[PDB]
Symmetry: C2
Subunit: 139 residues, 2 copies
Amino acid sequence: GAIKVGAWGGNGGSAFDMGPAYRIISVKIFSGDVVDGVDVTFTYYGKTETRHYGGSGGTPHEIVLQEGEYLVGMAGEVANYHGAVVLGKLGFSTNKKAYGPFGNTGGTPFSLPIAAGKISGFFGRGGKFLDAIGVYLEP
Amino acid sequence: MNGAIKVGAWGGNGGSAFDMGPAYRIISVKIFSGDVVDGVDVTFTYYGKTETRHYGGSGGTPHEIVLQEGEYLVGMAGEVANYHGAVVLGKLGFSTNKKAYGPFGNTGGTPFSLPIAAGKISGFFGRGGKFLDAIGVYLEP
């Protein structure tokens, strides 16, 4: 079925929904003070797609999933950046290594360790920056 | 855990690991608290028979969430805090697709939240000792 957990962040920008993926290939987090946006390249029913969520600013940090490597955790911090509630920090963990968090603006933290299962996709809200972010979870 | 989704394990590494396993239907959750979350008792239905598990510690005041039919646990938030030398849950709450409960506890710490946009909590797991060190959940559509 569909298990969507989260949507950590403010209510601004526009809602986005990547839907689940067959396999996530890489994730790119662009960040400056806060988290500007995220890119996701994944395979979907034979095809290879790429989605771009969030604004266009920031510097790239890419997570490329090797063989048999999945996303088993996501954490960061929601913040009020110059007036807007947006992810000020974000990071992910694979069953092999941890990443980030990326962004230099703290706020109220969140964390999602996944004991069993994996992240198969994203959803949330974006605009000039990455306002909020959630994930799809699968066995 | 044949296709189980276990998220979390929020809290500290002390105490003993506990695992309710998934339930066919959670009937009620009772959170016992004081300065922190002492323990949690779960009454559920599994493979036909009703069961009740006791997690965490024995102290604290009872706070019960009774799920009427059609009502489900769709969220869990609280706080992880050091309490006189031990990292445990100082606060813990739950939301249902009808009403929100708690948080229960009075010690503040690093917060956490699990709003469930789609799906529900079906079980629990974590670590227990004198109090509730860590708590996590099983999810399902």
